[PDB]
Design a protein around this ligand. Structure first.
Ligand code: MG
Ligand code: MG
Ligand code: MG
Ligand code: MG
Ligand code: MG
Ligand code: MG
Lengths: 239, 198, 233, 240, 212, 241, 222, 244, 204
């Protein structure tokens, strides 16, 4: 019973399930927040490197001056979502002045991923995504995850893509639910080491993008990310 | 009509725009900015029909900002003004035209030079050293033809303009309640807020 | 072992049968019981509201469509509501436009021609519900039997539903009597009530299980709910 | 063989045969072209004593001059009648003159036609008999699921068509000049009874209508009342 | 008609008259010109009764939807914008209406947006619309200050509207008063101009020219 | 869930329908594009051969898309022409609107987005083409881009597609200095290309070329789709009879 | 050109008694300087103890009422014969009326009944939708001849307590239905005397917590 | 396995596609509703994958209006749809009649939404192939029949309840409830009741994180009990067990 | 209430022995108020030339529309658009919008790269083609131009002379038209080379 727009005996829509199986096939992303920041980490499939470093793409994408998102799964797809989101980001601001609420955004995105699971003659987006940012005139960090089916959810820190299960575990016994990572510096320190499981040496496979309130934003440079690998392998050897 | 001025100088552009708002008889707000920054280095003053005005501006604004984060690269004053003209060109033959005139000031970073485009609601564009929509030109254009020099400093321009104003006051029937002045340059936009105490 | 001729409402069996429509009649036999019976002064619908659980309400089966018309149903609630709903418009169209109260013969016509469409086109399925209709026009009393197969028949009384037989017979016999009960409502009902109680098996009917409807010569269509039917037990 | 549009290895549309197969299975209907006008009759089957007599009419008029009846799938019949009803009334509004029976059939034949062309639709499950008058006489035809129809001197379908057929055969020769308007009815009344002897254990109710410039006056009227009775009794004597 | 609203140290003040009028004859003096959009918002009523009344209620609905979705209070700016957008949809059709949309949000502080049938959206601190808008802007201009006793703000409003009522034939009846705060609005009753006038001229000493 | 339909998803998140097409490429003529710090090169080997076929007052591998952009095809002939057409149009709307030349990155993107479109809806099959995009815009200078039917695009230093592009690929990885002036590339082009051929030897007729270059003497960009002659000649220059 | 509108005179009236309500309005019908019918009812019961009337242009009028009486019916079908609180009916009408905003119903309409507390209630309507809770309104041709009167009689406008100088206004007091109908008839007669479009007869619908009563009184066939 | 394709009729005249959708709701976490002449309670089991999900993120119980709450079970994406149509259906009514919608009248609209799905359409266009994979616990209060509780089933049908429970351990509770419920149950009583059947047929150690609890009254309207009220209420619960 | 007459401007062209010429003024302004003196009404698409008078935005829009299409032609046909061909096109184009006409007055002129034959045309706002062998005039001072041209055109001038004639024709008619002036520019089209010249004139 797999060609879904129909139900399994036990009430499943196996297609929608399988689609998730592709998000795992894809690369990996992870987000974390503090009481002032929200960092987004990602890896880099540095595989057939005989291509200009310069203009070729990188996971994290700004949707509005104060909000960004990342994914894992089909690049081919992902792009189209980002675009449609960016558009709605303005259509709002236009017809309402007030710039978008991160919760709202996601709900829109999830509404689209959700639209591609109803009419026969369309197929679901093989993309699950992490969306982070700070609401207009607000200082409370927000993190949400959306996935293929159409569900949106807020997390304190979450990860998607291949080997998410692992790092997830790691995170689970590191991120203190009671108090979030205070300083930005260390909030990063965290995420970085959490990716060092799958990375397999080299800040040459680790992308970091950091977001603060009041529409500030800022991707990271290679050495910056390296000075962390450094100051971490150091305390690992010190244990 | 209202007042919309603009003048291109050395390494910047300056936009003047009256502050008053009128409803037939009384004057509602008199501290109203007829401006709308499109991007960090592009800016647009406007005057036109009551509703048509503020809607269109924001709408244009929207598109740009969109393009600018999508691409991550900023759009050139030249091209910007081209698109605005595009939209009005259609607008004019639409079931209902947005009746609005504009001035667009920007600093083209590649050429490292300031450009200024005047555009009426019919979709009529032209790069100019300075301009003014509506009746605003009649009273001033002369003084500009007179004293204007391409090399003038940012300050030189203000003085000139300041003089144009003093005139508009002296011979114009309407009370425009003063002016808000603004400068676009390699540094971006800032407001000469001082033009009240000046 | 096999049967291919039962795919869509659209395919004929080698003999000339529509199994899909035949099945819809089976779900009709699955729902609760209900009865209708007429005379010359009134018409009556009596039905057995069936509840799901013991902590839940009994699902009603009667519906008004105008001061002078109504019906009961055996089967799927949704399907029914639609049909009755469409019906409601049809009366309204007449009243507003022509200002005449809709004749029952004609009411059946429309419900034939309506349910008909679903037997001829691909994609859909047929209506899973039967209806007993009652009303009082200018040709006095009338009562109808409707099937998803688009067959509406004018009767003197009847039942549909699970174990609908025992009443159909009680009726078949006590006919000569009730067709003559004119001027007396409570009589037609008690009669109808007996005809139905003549089909129970789980247990007897209570104030919650019972429901009745009537319409006649000066009796605009009205329904009796629960404790209001108390007397007829 | 399972879809409606398709053809068999040697050019055959099976769905239409089954259509036919269902037409036979239902009640029996007939019609007869006489002196001037026509006469129809059908077989309502009283399945119980709880059926109001003189009630569920299977015969229907079109405009105010066309008799019409059929058998097979009852709702299919009803449906088809509606289309025929529009076509008529539209034409009428257009040309003013009441619609020529000759063409009428086609209008319908053409509509029954279509339902043999696409797979998404179901073939018409009824054979239909009808007729009426005009300027150039009365006519009578009979349309099948295939959409093919023709003009007959009298027609028949449903369960026992042969009974009435060989029955219709006779009339031809002894009255090769068209049977009397009057006798037409009472004769039809009989031809039915004879053909009913299959549903014999189950009683029934006979329905009759007719057309004639002399009797109906150009119109189509329901044979009910006094003429109706004797026409039965008439049948009731020969019924031995 | 004479409606007006203004911002101040304590929040917002709204004041209206209540005289409807067909030609020369007075159709009513019992007019509600303040549309209680919802617990936290208000709209005045210039232009044409039905248009203000209808749409502003429509708007009230619109907020409830947003709010429920967001689990957050809708912000004045947006609310106003929406109405504007809706009104623009009909520029040309013949919709006539002046109006102040007033609110006091968590962040925005007190805030007035005058809005009209022409699609003019306007942030402001003082607005008067109507026939009497001219006389009312008088009293207001001179007497306004940003630190008013909550009670004086209410008095200024009264008196202002009152000047208009006296002179502007097309304005009058009774005045309605509402005050707005971070937790919603509060009605401050109705005051028959007839009675009130006599009072003011008395206490205030103003309105000398008038006999008796 | 196996093969058929594009709207289908296999139990492991695979879209076979695509993966076939995305592979169908391995049937087309070997096309190559290379980057240099002064010009871009598009080389291509013709297919469909016999002896009774012209190719001079035509082509079918190298199409000029913009006075500043060019592409190398490798797929379904029928497909290509359709995209090639709408790719040209859109490029012009950009011009007609912004009164400026359309950026390569952008153009590639929009196209990849249509190819992607056909990758997700029922009632249509994906395009079975692959493109080597080569062009210049003053935003990011010279650019070499590529895209498959999966709707993914890519920035490359020097790439190949079509036949033996695994073999041909590696040959490139060897000789390639980032600055590598154009002539060394044009040269390299053939070296790489010859080595990967079923023809007894490389004959001009069965071959397509073009280059892009700009400067101070031009002040602007000039591109040349090489005519039958120039080729028959430069071939000799690289030492070929 | 074609003129799609017309005036058929008429004058209606609504007073909100303490615990009742009246909706009166004459029976004449006109065109130019001619007569159409000596007797033609403009006031109706629509069920749920709610009276209506729309005066101005007959056709637009009766169509509204018809269009409404149906919208009441349908309200019962979807909410299990729940009664329509008068307040509700009005909000509903607003819409109906506003439906035809850019081609309005050329009529002043009024309704009256009782609220969810037993207090009388009247509602005056705009020809496109603005509704007000009035406790007394006259609409129609004569309008300006009766309204001034009720002003005075019903609200004792401009009437003070003697000997108080003019410092004590005469307090309002609520009048029994009898008392009201006396006022009403007088209002109409006076009106008929000085208004040509008004005369003939008067039909009054009285709403109370147990139904609708109808009483008629003949006017002058001037 | 032939006879499993949406608008297809089983030879016993049955629609499995429908019936399976029901089997979806099973997989949802448990939800329980209790109606007392005092007020109505809605409580649900949460069940969270990891401790990094922010509980409040799971909108299993939601407000539909000041006077109507709701709890869903099963497919979360589908929920959001019904919740939105409903929220809209409500406001719309209020705009038209200046009053409040009858709980069932509302409920009706929602069921009217559900069964409105075609397969190419034998007349009516219905853009949405299959049925909903979710049920509802609608619980409000109109002033005609006072406090009310309903069960929304994808089949387009529904029932009124005194107490009902949908989700994973449906019977585990329904059995329990079947003999715990009685009219004169006060509100405080009802809370500790829902709170008990959950814990029982629940899975883990009961605490505010794995259990959201709410209620609605004529007085204040639909209110979603913060973590404090719930937390202590656990105590008044786990304490009385010790005794009897 | 005339649109064409709002912005101003004129354009004129002539055919010489083996070449052509086309010139226009430079002024652009809303009725009385002069606005620009750097607004050119002549452009080209490869080797083809177009002069357009009339309503300003409509002029611009047209240029854009034509640049667009010629680019797309030359692309699929691997050869630049030819004069005679262009004419027939701009013709149809004007008509496609025959009920929402563009208020302009075009004038095409060039040299056919095959026959080598000089070409000139003029049209009304809907695409009616005026084939001429001497001169074409469009714009505000249409009438003043015909007065000049009729006297000055001489069949087959030498490019160096033709320039002087057309220059004077334009230049002088422009002074008796109040709505045209503020500079002008003349192009001279030879088989190969082309010379652009701005001339000095009254600036009033
Ligand atoms: Mg076919
Ligand atoms: Mg006054
Ligand atoms: Mg109510
Ligand atoms: Mg008289
Ligand atoms: Mg001219
Ligand atoms: Mg001149």
């Amino acid at each position: 019973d797999r060609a879904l727009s129909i139900f399994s005996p036990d009430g499943h829509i196996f297609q929608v399930e399988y689609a998730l199986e592709a998000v795992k096939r894809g690369t990996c992303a992870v987000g974390v927040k503090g009481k002032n920041c929200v960092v987004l980490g990602c890896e880099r499939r540095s595989t057939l490197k005989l291509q200009d470093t310069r203009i070729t793409p990188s996971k994290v994408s700004k949707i509005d001056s104060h909000v960004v998102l990342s994914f894992s799964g089909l690049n081919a797809d992902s792009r189209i979502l980002i675009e449609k989101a960016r558009v709605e980001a303005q259509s709002h601001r236009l017809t309402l002045e007030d710039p978008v609420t991160v919760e709202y955004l996601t709900r829109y995105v999830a509404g689209v991923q959700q639209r591609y699971t109803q009419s026969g003659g369309v197929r679901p987006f093989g993309v699950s995504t992490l969306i982070a940012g700070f609401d207009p005139r607000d200082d409370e960090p927000k993190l949400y995850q959306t996935e293929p089916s159409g569900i949106y959810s807020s997390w304190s820190a979450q990860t998607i893509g291949r080997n998410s299960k692992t790092v997830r575990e790691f995170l689970e016994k590191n991120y203190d639910r009671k108090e979030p990572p205070a300083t930005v510096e260390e909030c990063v320190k965290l995420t970085v080491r959490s990716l060092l499981e799958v990375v397999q040496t080299g800040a040459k496979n680790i992308e970091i993008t950091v977001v603060k309130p009041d529409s500030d934003i800022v991707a990271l440079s290679s050495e910056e990310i390296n000075q962390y690998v450094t100051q971490i392998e150091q305390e690992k050897q010190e244990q | 009509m209202d007042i919309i001025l603009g003048i291109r100088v050395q390494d910047s552009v300056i936009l003047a725009s009256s502050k008053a708002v009128t409803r037939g008889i009384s004057v509602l707000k008199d501290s109203d900015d007829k401006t709308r920054q499109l991007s960090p280095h592009t800016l647009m003053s406007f005057a036109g029909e009551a509703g048509d005005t503020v809607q269109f501006a924001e709408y244009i604004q929207a598109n740009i900002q969109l393009y600018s984060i999508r691409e991550d690269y900023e759009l050139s004053p030249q091209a910007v003004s081209s698109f605005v003209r595009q939209e009005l060109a259609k607008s004019i033959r639409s079931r209902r035209p947005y009746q609005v005139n504009v001035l667009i000031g920007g600093y083209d970073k590649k050429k490292n030079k300031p450009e200024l485009y005047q555009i009426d609601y019919l979709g009529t564009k032209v790069e100019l050293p300075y301009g003014a929509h509506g009746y605003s030109g009649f009273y001033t254009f002369s003084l500009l033809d007179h004293h204007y020099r391409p090399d003038m400093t940012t300050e030189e321009g203000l003085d000139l303009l300041k003089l144009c104003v003093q005139e508009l006051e002296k011979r114009m029937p309407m009370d425009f309640k003063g002016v808000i002045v603004k400068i676009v340059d390699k540094d971006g936009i800032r407001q000469v807020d001082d033009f009240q105490a000046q | 072992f096999r049967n291919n001729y039962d795919g869509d409402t659209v395919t004929f069996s080698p003999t000339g049968r529509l199994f899909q429509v035949e099945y819809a009649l089976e779900a009709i036999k699955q729902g609760s019981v209900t009865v209708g019976l007429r005379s010359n002064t009134h018409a009556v619908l009596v039905a057995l509201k069936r509840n799901a659980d013991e902590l839940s309400s009994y699902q009603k089966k009667i519906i008004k469509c105008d001061e002078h018309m109504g019906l009961s149903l055996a089967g799927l609630a949704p399907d029914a509501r639609v049909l009755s709903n469409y019906l409601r418009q049809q009366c309204n169209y007449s009243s507003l436009v022509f200002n005449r109260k809709l004749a029952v013969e004609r009411a059946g016509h429309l419900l034939c021609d309506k349910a008909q469409k679903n037997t001829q086109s691909y994609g859909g399925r047929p209506y899973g519900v039967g209806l007993l209709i009652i009303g009082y026009d200018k040709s006095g009393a009338h009562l109808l039997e409707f099937q998803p197969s688009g067959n509406v028949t004018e009767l003197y009384g009847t039942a549909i539903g699970a174990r609908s037989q025992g009443a159909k017979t009680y009726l078949e016999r006590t006919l000569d009597t009730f067709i003559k009960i004119d001027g007396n409502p409570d009589e037609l009902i008690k009669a109808g009530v007996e005809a139905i109680s003549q089909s129970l098996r789980d247990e007897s009917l209570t104030v919650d299980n019972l429901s009745i409807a009537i319409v006649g010569k000066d009796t605009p269509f009205t329904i009796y709910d629960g404790e209001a039917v108390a007397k007829y037990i | 063989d399972l879809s409606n549009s398709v053809f068999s290895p040697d050019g055959r549309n099976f769905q239409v045969e089954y259509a036919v197969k269902a037409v036979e299975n239902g009640t029996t209907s007939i019609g007869i072209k006489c002196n001037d006008g026509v006469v129809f009759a059908v077989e309502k089957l009283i399945t119980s004593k709880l059926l109001v007599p003189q009630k569920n009419v299977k015969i229907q008029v079109v405009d105010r001059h066309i008799g019409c009846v059929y058998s097979g799938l009852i709702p299919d019949g009803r449906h088809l009648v509606n289309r025929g009803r529009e076509e008529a009334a539209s034409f009428k509004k257009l040309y003013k003159t009441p619609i020529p029976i000759p063409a009428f059939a086609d209008r319908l034949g053409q509509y029954v036609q279509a339902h043999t062309l696409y797979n998404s639709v179901r073939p018409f499950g009824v054979s239909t008999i009808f007729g009426g008058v005009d300027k150039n006489g009365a006519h009578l035809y009979m349309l099948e699921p295939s959409g093919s129809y023709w003009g007959y001197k009298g027609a028949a379908t449903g369960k026992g068509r042969q009974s009435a057929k060989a029955e219709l055969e006779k009339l031809v020769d002894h009255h090769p000049e068209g049977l009397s308007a009057r006798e037409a009815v009472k004769q039809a009344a009989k031809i039915i009874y004879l053909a009913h002897e299959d549903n014999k254990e189950k009683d029934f109710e006979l329905e009759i209508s007719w057309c004639s410039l002399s009797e109906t006056n150009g119109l189509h009227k329901f044979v009910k009342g006094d003429l109706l009775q004797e026409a039965i009794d008439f049948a009731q004597k020969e019924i031995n | 008609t004479t409606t007006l609203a203004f911002r101040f140290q304590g929040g917002i003040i709204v004041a209206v008259d209540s005289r409807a009028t067909a030609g020369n004859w007075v159709a009513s003096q019992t007019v509600k010109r303040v549309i209680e959009i919802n617990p936290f918002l208000l709209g005045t009523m210039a232009g044409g009764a039905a248009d203000c009344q209808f749409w502003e209620t429509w708007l009230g609905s619109q907020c409830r939807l947003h709010e429920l979705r967001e689990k957050e209070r809708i912000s004045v700016a947006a609310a106003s914008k929406i109405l504007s957008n809706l009104v623009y949809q009909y520029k040309g059709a013949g919709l006539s209406m002046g109006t102040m949309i007033c609110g006091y949000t968590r962040k925005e502080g007190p805030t007035i947006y005058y809005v009209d049938s022409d699609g003019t959206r306007l942030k402001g601190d003082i607005f008067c619309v109507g026939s009497g808008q001219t006389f009312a802007y008088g009293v207001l201009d001179s007497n306004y200050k940003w630190d008013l006793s909550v009670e004086d703000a209410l008095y200024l409003g009264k008196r202002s509207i009152l000047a208009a009522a006296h002179r502007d034939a097309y304005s009058g009846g009774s005045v309605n008063l509402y005050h707005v705060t971070e937790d919603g609005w509060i009605y401050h009753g109705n005051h028959d101009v007839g009675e009130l006038f006599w009072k003011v001229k008395e206490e205030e000493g103003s309105f000398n020219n008038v006999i008796g | 869930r196996y093969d058929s339909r594009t709207t289908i998803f296999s139990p492991e998140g695979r879209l076979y329908q695509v993966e076939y097409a995305l592979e169908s490429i391995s049937h087309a003529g070997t096309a190559i594009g290379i980057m240099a710090s002064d010009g871009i090169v598009l080389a291509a080997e013709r297919k469909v051969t016999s002896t009774l076929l012209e190719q001079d007052t035509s082509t079918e591998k190298l199409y000029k898309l913009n006075d500043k952009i060019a592409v190398a095809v490798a797929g379904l002939t029928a497909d290509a022409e359709i995209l090639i057409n709408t790719a040209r149009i859109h490029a012009q709307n950009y011009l007609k609107t912004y009164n400026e030349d359309i950026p390569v990155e952008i153009l590639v993107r929009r196209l990849s987005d249509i190819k992607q479109g056909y990758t997700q809806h029922g009632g249509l099959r994906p395009f079975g083409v692959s493109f080597i995009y080569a062009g210049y815009d003053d935003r990011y200078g010279y650019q070499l881009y590529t895209s498959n039917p999966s709707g993914n695009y890519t920035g490359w230093k020097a790439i190949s597609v079509g036949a033996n592009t695994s073999a041909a690929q590696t040959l490139l990885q060897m000789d390639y200095k980032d600055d590598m002036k154009v002539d060394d590339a044009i040269e390299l082009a053939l070296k790489t290309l010859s080595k990967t051929t079923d023809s007894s030897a490389l004959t001009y007729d069965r071959l397509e070329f073009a280059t892009i270059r700009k400067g101070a003497n031009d002040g602007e960009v000039y591109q040349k789709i090489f005519k039958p002659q120039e080729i028959k000649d430069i071939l000799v220059k690289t030492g070929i009879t | 050109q074609f003129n799609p509108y017309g005036d058929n005179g008429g004058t209606i009236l609504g007073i909100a008694g303490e615990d009742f309500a009246v909706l009166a309005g004459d029976t004449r019908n006109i065109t130019d300087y001619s007569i159409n019918s000596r007797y033609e009812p403009k006031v109706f019961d629509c069920g749920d103890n709610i009276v209506m009337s729309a005066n101005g242009f007959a056709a637009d009028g009766d169509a509204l009422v018809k269009r409404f009486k149906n919208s009441v019916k349908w309200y019962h079908f979807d909410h299990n014969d729940k009664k329509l609180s008068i307040n509700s009916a009005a909000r509903n009408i607003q819409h109906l009326l506003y439906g035809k905003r850019f081609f309005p119903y050329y009529v002043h309409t009024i309704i009256a009944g009782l609220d969810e507390d037993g207090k009388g209630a009247v509602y005056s309507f705009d020809p496109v939708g603005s509704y007000e809770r009035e406790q007394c309104r006259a609409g129609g041709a004569a309008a300006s001849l009766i309204m001034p009167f009720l002003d005075n009689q019903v609200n004792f406008k401009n009437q003070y307590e003697p000997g108080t100088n003019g410092k004590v206004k005469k307090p309002l007091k609520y009048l029994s239905v009898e008392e009201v109908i006396k006022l009403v008839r007088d209002s109409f007669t006076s009106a008929t005397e000085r208004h040509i479009q008004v005369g003939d007869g008067l039909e009054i619908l009285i709403v109370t917590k147990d139904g609708v009563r109808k009483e008629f009184y003949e006017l002058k066939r001037d | 396995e032939y006879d499993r394709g949406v608008s297809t009729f089983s030879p016993e005249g049955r629609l499995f596609q429908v019936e399976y959708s029901l089997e979806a709701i099973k997989l949802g976490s448990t939800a329980i509703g209790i109606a007392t002449k005092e007020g109505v309670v809605l409580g649900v089991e949460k069940r969270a994958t990891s401790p990094l999900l922010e509980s409040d993120s799971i909108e299993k119980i939601v407000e539909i209006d000041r006077h109507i709450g709701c709890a869903m079970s099963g497919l979360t994406a589908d929920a959001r749809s019904m919740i939105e149509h409903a929220r809209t259906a409500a406001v719309t009514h209020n705009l038209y009649y200046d009053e409040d919608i009858n709980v069932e009248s509302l409920t009706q609209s929602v069921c009217d939404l559900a069964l409105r799905f075609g397969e190419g359409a034998s007349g009516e266009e219905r853009l949405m192939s299959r049925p909903f994979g979710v049920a509802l616990l609608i619980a409000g209060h109109d002033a005609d029949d006072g406090y009310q509780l309903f069960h929304a089933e994808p089949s387009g049908t529904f029932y009124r309840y005194n107490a009902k429970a949908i989700g994973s351990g449906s019977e585990g509770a329904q059995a329990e409830l079947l003999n715990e419920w009685h009219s004169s149950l006060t509100l405080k009583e009802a809370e500790l009741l829902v709170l008990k059947i959950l814990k029982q047929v629940m899975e883990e150690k009961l605490d505010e994180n794995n259990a959201q609890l709410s209620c609605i009254t004529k007085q204040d309207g639909f209110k979603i009990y913060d973590n404090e009220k719930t937390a202590e209420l656990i105590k008044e619960l786990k304490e009385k067990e010790a005794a009897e | 209430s005339d649109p064409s007459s709002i912005n101003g401007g004129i354009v004129v062209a002539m055919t010489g022995k083996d070449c052509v010429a086309i010139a226009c003024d430079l002024r652009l302004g809303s009725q009385s108020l002069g606005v620009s003196n750097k607004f050119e009404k002549i452009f080209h698409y490869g080797h083809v030339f177009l002069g357009i008078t009339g309503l300003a935005t409509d002029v611009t829009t047209l240029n854009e529309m034509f640049r667009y299409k010629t680019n797309l032609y030359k692309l699929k046909e691997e050869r630049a658009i030819e004069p005679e061909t262009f004419t027939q096109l701009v013709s149809s184009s004007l008509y496609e919008r025959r009920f929402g006409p563009y208020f302009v007055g075009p004038v095409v002129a060039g040299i056919n790269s095959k026959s080598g034959k000089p070409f000139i045309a003029g049209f009304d706002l809907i695409g009616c083609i005026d084939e001429a062998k001497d001169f074409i005039v469009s714009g505000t001072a249409s009438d003043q131009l015909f007065g000049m041209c009729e006297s000055l055109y001489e069949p087959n001038l030498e490019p160096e002379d033709l320039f002087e004639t057309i220059s004077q024709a334009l230049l002088n008619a422009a002074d008796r038209d109040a709505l045209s002036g503020w500079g002008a520019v003349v192009y001279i089209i030879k088989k190969d080379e082309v010379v652009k010249r701005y001339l000095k004139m009254r600036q009033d």
